[PDB]
């Protein structure tokens, strides 16, 4: 009596073409950093970062993404 | 009596063509940073970032995205 | 009575073509960092980072991603 | 009696600065070449070139030129 | 009586700076070449070139030139 036929068909394409990719320059924190501290009181947790941190250069030739989710729930 | 026929057909395409990609310059925090502190009281948690942080250069040749979601719920 | 036929068909493609990929320059923390501290009191945990930390250059020729999830739940 | 004092002083400079140089594409003779010849008479020297010849891509980072000529003639 | 003092002084400079140089593509003679010949008479010297010949890609990092000529003639 209860017939379920789940037939998803996918013939798709995610495509990229690039003749040339390059000459990328990333220069963070060229300038001068000066931190002068006198008579500081801390009564709890301290987190400090000084300088050039967590800087990213990401250059994928493709960088193509496909996300697909299939869910069948029967109750 | 209860017949369900789930037939999604997909023949689609997400496409990019680029003849050339380049000569990208990213220069964050060229200037001078000076932090002078005198007589500071902190009675709770402190988080400090000084300089050039979390700067991103992202250059994908494609960068093409396809998101697809299929959900069948029977109750 | 309860017949479930789960037939997902996938003939898809995630593709990239790059003629050339290169000449990438990443120079974080070129500048001068000076940290001068006098008479500091800390009554709890301290975390300190000074200089050039956690800097990333990521250059994949492809960098193509496919995520697929299939879930069948019967109850 | 005849005194000649030839003192040319040169402190000059020819200078170039280029942040990035690239992504140059040179595609000569992409099309189709068809040469059909019937019943030709030549009674003297023949020179023939067919296709893609003498094509130049010249990409100097500098390409700076200085020409200097000094001539002293006494008679 | 006849005194000649030839003192050329040269402190000059020809200089180039290039941050990056690249991603150069040279594709001559991609197309199709077809040469069909029937009943040709040649009564003198023949020179023939067919296809992709004498194609140049020249990419110097510097490519800086200085030409200097000094001539003293006495008669």
Tab-separated table of C-alpha atoms in Angstrom, chain B residues 10-61:
chain	number	residue	atom	x	y	z
B	10	UNK	CA	18.970	18.042	-13.050
B	11	UNK	CA	21.108	18.689	-16.172
B	12	UNK	CA	22.183	22.221	-15.191
B	13	UNK	CA	25.594	23.912	-15.329
B	14	UNK	CA	27.369	26.684	-13.387
B	15	UNK	CA	30.283	27.832	-15.577
B	16	UNK	CA	32.943	30.567	-15.645
B	17	UNK	CA	35.580	31.559	-18.220
B	18	UNK	CA	38.356	34.074	-17.479
B	19	UNK	CA	41.037	34.985	-20.054
B	20	UNK	CA	43.416	36.338	-17.414
B	21	UNK	CA	43.184	36.922	-13.641
B	22	UNK	CA	45.937	38.797	-11.810
B	23	UNK	CA	47.903	41.861	-10.678
B	24	UNK	CA	46.123	41.939	-7.278
B	25	UNK	CA	47.714	44.020	-4.474
B	26	UNK	CA	46.514	43.933	-0.832
B	27	UNK	CA	48.481	46.145	1.608
B	28	UNK	CA	46.714	46.450	5.019
B	29	UNK	CA	48.339	48.273	7.945
B	30	UNK	CA	50.996	50.302	6.143
B	31	UNK	CA	50.769	53.130	8.702
B	32	UNK	CA	52.266	53.510	12.163
B	33	UNK	CA	50.440	52.173	15.251
B	34	UNK	CA	51.309	53.660	18.669
B	35	UNK	CA	49.506	52.579	21.875
B	36	UNK	CA	50.538	54.354	25.119
B	37	UNK	CA	48.817	53.288	28.370
B	38	UNK	CA	49.249	54.694	31.911
B	39	UNK	CA	47.373	53.723	35.113
B	40	UNK	CA	44.690	51.343	33.785
B	41	UNK	CA	42.624	49.094	36.101
B	42	UNK	CA	40.860	45.965	34.767
B	43	UNK	CA	38.611	43.908	37.101
B	44	UNK	CA	37.372	41.413	34.443
B	45	UNK	CA	38.567	39.521	31.326
B	46	UNK	CA	40.544	41.518	28.716
B	47	UNK	CA	41.021	40.731	25.000
B	48	UNK	CA	43.426	42.921	22.984
B	49	UNK	CA	44.552	42.874	19.326
B	50	UNK	CA	47.106	45.415	18.013
B	51	UNK	CA	48.582	45.590	14.473
B	52	UNK	CA	47.576	43.737	11.272
B	53	UNK	CA	45.340	40.727	11.971
B	54	UNK	CA	42.904	38.482	10.048
B	55	UNK	CA	43.566	40.125	6.657
B	56	UNK	CA	42.509	37.961	3.688
B	57	UNK	CA	43.385	37.837	-0.022
B	58	UNK	CA	41.170	35.196	-1.705
B	59	UNK	CA	41.609	34.797	-5.499
B	60	UNK	CA	39.911	31.641	-6.911
B	61	UNK	CA	40.067	31.035	-10.680
